[PDB]
Amino acid sequence: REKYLKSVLRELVTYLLFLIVLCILTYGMMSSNVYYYTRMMSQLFLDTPVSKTEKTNFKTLSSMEDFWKFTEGSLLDGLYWKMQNRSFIFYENLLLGVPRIRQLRVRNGSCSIPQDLRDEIKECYDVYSVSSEDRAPFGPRNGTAWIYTSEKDLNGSSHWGIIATYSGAGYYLDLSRTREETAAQVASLKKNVWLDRGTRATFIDFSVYNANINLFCVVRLLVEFPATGGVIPSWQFQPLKLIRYVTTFDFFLAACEIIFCFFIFYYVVEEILEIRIHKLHYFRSFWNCLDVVIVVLSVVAIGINIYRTSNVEVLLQFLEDQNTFPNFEHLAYWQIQFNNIAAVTVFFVWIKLFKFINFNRTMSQLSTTMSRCAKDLFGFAIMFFIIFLAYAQLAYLVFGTQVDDFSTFQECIFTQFRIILGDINFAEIEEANRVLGPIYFTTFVFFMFFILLNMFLAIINDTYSEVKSDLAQQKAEMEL
Amino acid sequence: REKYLKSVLRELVTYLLFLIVLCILTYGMMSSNVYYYTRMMSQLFLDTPVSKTEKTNFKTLSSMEDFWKFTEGSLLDGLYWKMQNRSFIFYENLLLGVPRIRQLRVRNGSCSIPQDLRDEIKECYDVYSVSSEDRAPFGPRNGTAWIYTSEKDLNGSSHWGIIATYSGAGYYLDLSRTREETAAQVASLKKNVWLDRGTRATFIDFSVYNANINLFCVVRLLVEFPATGGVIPSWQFQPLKLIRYVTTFDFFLAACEIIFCFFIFYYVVEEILEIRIHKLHYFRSFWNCLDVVIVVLSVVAIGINIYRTSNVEVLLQFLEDQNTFPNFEHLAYWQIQFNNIAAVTVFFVWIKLFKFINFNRTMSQLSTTMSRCAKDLFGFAIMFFIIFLAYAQLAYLVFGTQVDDFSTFQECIFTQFRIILGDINFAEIEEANRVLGPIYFTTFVFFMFFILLNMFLAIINDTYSEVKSDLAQQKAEMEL
Amino acid sequence: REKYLKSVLRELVTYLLFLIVLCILTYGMMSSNVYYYTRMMSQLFLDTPVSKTEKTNFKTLSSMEDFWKFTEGSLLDGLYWKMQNRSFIFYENLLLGVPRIRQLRVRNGSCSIPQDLRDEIKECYDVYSVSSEDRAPFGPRNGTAWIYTSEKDLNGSSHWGIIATYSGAGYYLDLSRTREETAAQVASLKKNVWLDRGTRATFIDFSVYNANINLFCVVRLLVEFPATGGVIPSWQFQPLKLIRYVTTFDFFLAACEIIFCFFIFYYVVEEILEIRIHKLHYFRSFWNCLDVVIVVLSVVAIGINIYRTSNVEVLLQFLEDQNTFPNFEHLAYWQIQFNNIAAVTVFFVWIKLFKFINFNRTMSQLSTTMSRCAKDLFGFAIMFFIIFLAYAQLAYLVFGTQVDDFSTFQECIFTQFRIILGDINFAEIEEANRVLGPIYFTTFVFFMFFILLNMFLAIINDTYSEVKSDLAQQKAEMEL
Amino acid sequence: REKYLKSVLRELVTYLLFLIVLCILTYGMMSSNVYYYTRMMSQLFLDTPVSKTEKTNFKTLSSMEDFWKFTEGSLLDGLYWKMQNRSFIFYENLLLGVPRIRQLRVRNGSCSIPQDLRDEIKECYDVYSVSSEDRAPFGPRNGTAWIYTSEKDLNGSSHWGIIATYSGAGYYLDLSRTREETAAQVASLKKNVWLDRGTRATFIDFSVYNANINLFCVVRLLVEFPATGGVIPSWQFQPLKLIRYVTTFDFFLAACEIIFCFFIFYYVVEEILEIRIHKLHYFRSFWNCLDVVIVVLSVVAIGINIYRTSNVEVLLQFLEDQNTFPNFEHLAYWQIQFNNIAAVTVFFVWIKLFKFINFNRTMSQLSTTMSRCAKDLFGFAIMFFIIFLAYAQLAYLVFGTQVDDFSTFQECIFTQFRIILGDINFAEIEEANRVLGPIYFTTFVFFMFFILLNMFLAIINDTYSEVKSDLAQQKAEMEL
Ligand SMILES: CCCCCCCCCCCO[C@@H]1O[C@H](CO)[C@@H](O[C@H]2O[C@H](CO)[C@@H](O)[C@H](O)[C@H]2O)[C@H](O)[C@H]1O
Ligand SMILES: CCCCCCCCCCCO[C@@H]1O[C@H](CO)[C@@H](O[C@H]2O[C@H](CO)[C@@H](O)[C@H](O)[C@H]2O)[C@H](O)[C@H]1O
Ligand SMILES: CCCCCCCCCCCO[C@@H]1O[C@H](CO)[C@@H](O[C@H]2O[C@H](CO)[C@@H](O)[C@H](O)[C@H]2O)[C@H](O)[C@H]1O
Ligand SMILES: *[C@@H]1O[C@H](CO)[C@@H](O)[C@H](O)[C@H]1NC(C)=O
Ligand SMILES: [Ca+2]
């Protein structure tokens, strides 16, 4: 018992040191106010009205001419700021290099006009795919904006947008350091008709740097031009910390990174020495599976932070020439992947803390309750999600062309979780379909929220009463 | 046991093939992005401001003169697009033929002015009914806009609107291919006063075609003119796929339609051979009743898809002359009916999957729980809906003239489901009636959400504890 | 048993006839679309912008000069409509007579300036009470707008507003039939400064009549001028049916009124013959108490419908002279009281239906469950409302000066019911107080929604398990 | 038993007198309509558009030039009102003295530009701290607006803002009694560039007095200028009652204050005489701990109301000279502290009422239920908050740079309480991260709302069934 308590004590203090080091590392991932660095950029570029007589945003673009009014107007008035040269956005954020506008095109004849309509309609342009993509030169043909450049040649990568996944290739134009040259270039693209019926996407990419808080911010504005016509705007404001060793707390964060990877080396050694004793008996446990998940996610985090996130070859390459476009699209991608991995790792490391709070009879009753009802809650989770996805496919077939919240199948699932909580927009459901809007909503509230929601609760009630009346009979019958 | 498992296995693989074929069919009913084809049309016609100095939408029309500003303004600037002839909306969507504006009128003297007020008020115009409807010529009397045309003669059908159900007859005017002729026609209707005090509805109907994604879109804009005065706008943007065999996946969808109707022939043969053995004993089951519901809904789906939805006689009739109005009002109606039928059929086919997940002792406990509490949940559902409709009739008598959410009795029911979830607009309830708004809301939250909502939960708790303690005593007493 | 079933059968068919007659009566109280008669009047007078260069509504008035812009602007453009004389609003609704603007004033010196500030501040005007009210003539003193008229002399009655209850007396001005005379009168009130620092309320009253649907609509617009400065607007659009016998369905409604008061005579005779047998034993029942409540509310409904609602002496008095103000302020008051009484009566008549659904063993189990848990749910309702009003008084002391939803104590109670459901505006709570906003919200969610909400549920679970295990032991032990 | 009931009776009537006196005291803390005194000031200064061609508020300031448009525009049009001298805001609220604008600055060179960027970027200005704060004179150097004044010399105190805690020192400028002198001063600050890149905060402070209701109102407008660039506006409208003895009800409130502090003297004597008998046995009770909490909070309330809130030395000092700035920043601070203390004291005094409702067998069952489940609910509250803060740290790492509701860690906690209720903005979560937005939301709804929320409920169900079946066996076995 003293050796069991000694081993529990040393693994507890090991885990507590590990949890302290990890919570220090994610204290330095989040600087104190980066939200007020992304929302000023967002409200400068997305929320300002496009022209002085227009009320459209970037968020509410609806046409191609609104996109030209944005590119000639709010984009140029946001990027270029007159000095008290080169532009400091909000007189703080240095615009790095030049921005870049890039277009993706589909071919004429990339779809098939039906045989009874080949007299009336001459041309058709398919939805964006890589097979449908246009490689031909067009327009005046005398620049990089008019000639196709491959994905390998403009150092790009695939972007996952709202209606398609867009290749990193296309028809790009790097802009200029000053507003007047850039306005001349945008007017020369609009005059020669650069965006037409074959256009399926337009990317606007630039990067700023804040010397005060030492953060880059990689901006990507995407406008998707569907085959149906119109405009779907999308944006991405992504901060990067690419220059690490500036302040003392950054050196302490580097020290905690080293101490963290020593902890992860220790846990990988420990779980390998535990799994070698017994093979499939190791996975007949929840905590060994959770330790496997933690060390896999942590090795993936160390791998991203070595081979991807800390490869600032493009930054030193940009610091040679300030008149080019800085390719920060890969650093931002792997910073997003690293933040997702690290957040999920911190989550499961806090879930691991439940090995060490069976310190009491009450906590042991709670733990025994949920471990004994896990199987029956999983069975009813299967049954619940069968009825839940039946309703989601019903709602997708009924409202999928009319309602924003039901437009894709996963959005139907997430909308139903919101309906179960109470986040409804029933006005648009009830005006999309006036008979099955009502019937869908009322039968989903009755059969899910009144009845099947209470069945998880019934499983937990019965298991808690069983565990209490069993561990009380065990406590009494030993005392008799 | 081996033959029972063999029959269960063959009906399981039959059902799984059927579910795969049906989920393929409703993968091809929903194209990937039709929502972005209806919302661009909606934001072009509903959400654009009516005039350049006006802020009213079509959604926020409040008067007859706002309707004339819409018909002279946002409607003409949305329909007619200058080519790089005939108009391509968003340079993608071909306007098919001409649009059509149609009016429904009631008679002077169609109601009775009370005897003490026949001196002051000369004329009264009743709420729209078919008996009150005006058949007389009026105005200049020299067109189709000024002379009544029956429902049989303009090929129309009854429309179910917000305050009435409107006959397909009336005073119609087909518009023109170009903007200037159509503006002349609308100005000639406004000059001669076409809409006056007898007007009860105005329909605007047109159809576009997108060659890129191969979808028609049947637009119907309704403005209802109540007897109280004012305007109630209503719209309907409905996509159709009327040209089937264009792509290869469409041929695969046709093959899956044939394989589906062979499955439905198989299930109708099976359920007839099962019902012939025993009459009313067949309906003493849930799964035989569900199989009856599935084959009835599926036969109705096949009947709509043969005798109604796949009758594109008006499309080939329209392709002869591009200067007429294409009657797509029936195809859109039966496409809505087919989508409702098919969505409900897919829902119950997924519910049928619960015959085949009694594969475990836990799943059998869950199934036995809900099948044994079904009767007592139905009894308390009767009692709950009696108190629920008592509150709904209370709230209709109190707020039915003041609040949008309580304006009709079914909307009172749906508003109370939203209050139970937590979708409240209590500001308008509390300013409609400051005493019974409060009392209604607080007693509805106390008696429904705190007390009667927990009674379903009590039934499910007690039935689950009973089923577990019974199937555990059955498992133990057989082992003793 | 046959005589018991015979008496139950005759009282059941008596109650069913009574419920049919009552549901017919409240089918004719609610005409089919009165909501679209109040919202057109509301959107004409409340929601139109006050001036063509102004964006304020009547709903968003914030100053006295905005009130003059409304009275010179949106009010006159809403009331007076040029004919194709006298004004038909939306060319349907006849403006009856002239409108009337009325002011309530407080005295100079109606409060006490503190002794250290009687040098700087000369005058102070107390919050509106009847003791503080000004009776003096003022201004040019040569009209009814400048001379006090008592409540008995302008036939008015007390109005219960947002911050005070306002007497029906004051300084009134009846306006005119045409727009130009009324604009001259409003400009003459603004020139001579009619609203100043003593003003505490301004009422605007008018009535319209719709000949098409046979409804009056009594409009009262109130602007309250607090002692703090500013404007609190308030409105009331109230439809009346003052001319009864016009259509055939109205005669059938009168016949159902007579049959209803015969039913209420029958039930009063029955409950008096039942209460005379046994005194306080009669009130030891729920259904006898509910019958007492129904016949009291029904006698109050008949009394309002005879002595108040059907006294259309002011209507025939108005029909003599169309150039005066029609006093419909009492008819609207008693129509609101009659609608409240009748809605509550219909509610309890539907609750009475539970005497007659103990037709089954399951329904008897549900009824026995709730009748046996009524006492313990009432005890925990006492305990719950003690903690609930403790939180409401906490939230009133903390947010009562900052948040709209916590401004009065009853609004704190209703806001907490909304928080329990999930209708939160946490942004304004969290910016009103950044420490106790959080602590109030999180401890109210934890202690009410997680814990004390589940205690009602515990009472109902235990009582249902007790009633089922008791009525099953009664069913088994009789069979053994 | 008679002496036990006698002691319970005398402590009950003592507590009831105490509760009446305390509820009278917090009836006079809240005047009837102070909310309509703060919202008129708020809608005058925050919600009016900044210029006649601008639509920005004070609430929606986004730049430094919008702040100059506010200070030259809406602030001057709100403060200065032309008389029928000195300004009465809404012709009721006397502007006391002059306002004051004050700036906080950071030094050039207060951060470290990284070594590879010291060529491009010359200067950097750190986030506001006291060590980074600028003390140097700047600009024209010939006023108080251009020369640093310490916190001890301008009588200020530290302000806790949104992104920092701001010292009470800085660069202040007292404004003027009239609009033209103040406009000259603000134009002279804008001309000489008073706000530049070193500015981190700008305070605008003024005080009004309403003679009608006898309330001061201390306004503090804060604009925070982050290092990222932009503007974060913040406000504080705080009413004070600094002149006590004006009306008779104020004398009754003073009498109730004296009677309250006599009650608190009585309870401190009683709890000291009870704690002296037994030391740590005293704290083995809930009601003795609650009495300790009440008398500690009440002594803190009396201490604030004597040594801080009732020290109106600055008011009589201001009444000598009406041309200076009245320092009401300390009185408002301690009035906020006193309102927090008094509201929490009233809350726990109402919670103390549960000593005296064990008057019944049912109330004793409810009390015994919650006192016996307190320990197991505390254990599961520990386990629940471990999983809850694991999710909050996940959501802070994922959405903390993108979403308003997740910007700080405590706001992540409060957002998750809102998600559990049903106050979601899922659109911004789902567009911040399209993979972990969904996964976070759905796994938080499944694991918290479906499963772990029902575990508190299971504890309460089992404890209530145990207490009922135990106190029924105690009632029966004594009767056998
Ligand atoms: C017992 C089995 C149940 C009985 C059978 C069910 C009832 C069958 C007939 C119901 C009519 O079917 C109903 O038709 C109306 C139009 O008339 C359709 O409505 C559709 O068009 C109307 C207007 O035309 C729109 O207002 C509505 O938003 C749209 O959904 C509705 O979607 C469909 O659901
Ligand atoms: C014990 C049985 C309960 C005691 C009897 C109940 C109290 C009877 C008297 C209550 C007064 O009845 C109450 O009158 C006010 C106006 O004064 C009505 O209010 C009505 O007009 C006022 C203004 O005039 C509006 O503010 C309010 O929105 C409207 O509902 C309210 O709807 C009605 O509910
Ligand atoms: C909870 C629901 C309650 C709804 C029912 C309320 C009670 C309504 C019935 C009360 C008696 O209803 C009463 O009907 C008589 C009919 O002779 C009406 O009388 C009116 O018309 C009759 C005949 O047309 C005239 O002789 C009489 O002078 C006139 O006042 C009276 O205006 C109405 O007051
Ligand atoms: C007196 O009444 C007349 C109307 O007869 C009005 O025009 C005039 O303004 C009033 N006198 C003053 C001083 O306002
Ligand atoms: Ca909710």
Numbering used by the authors:
A (entry chain C), B (entry chain B), C (entry chain A), D (entry chain D): 213 to 296, 305 to 700
Task: Quote the authors verbatim.
Polycystin-2 (PC2) is a transient receptor potential (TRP) channel present in ciliary membranes of the kidney.
To investigate possible binding of anionic phospholipids to PC2, we determined two cryo-EM structures of PC2: in the presence of PI(4,5)P2 to 3 Å resolution, and of PI(3,5)P2 to 3.4 Å. The overall conformation of the protein is the same as our original structure, i.e., a closed state at both the selectivity filter and the lower gate, although we did in this case observe a disulfide bond in the TLC1 region of the TOP domain (between residues Cys331 and Cys344). The two structures reported here also differ from our previous structure in that they both display a spherical density below the selectivity filter consistent with a bound ion. The identity of the bound cation is unclear as both calcium and sodium ions were present in the buffer used to prepare the EM grids. In particular, we examined the region of the maps where phospholipid was found in the simulations to see whether there was any evidence for density possibly corresponding to tightly bound lipids at these sites. The cholesterol must have remained bound to PC2 throughout the extraction and purification process, since neither cholesterol, nor the cholesterol mimetic, cholesteryl hemi-succinate (CHS), was used in the PC2 purifications.
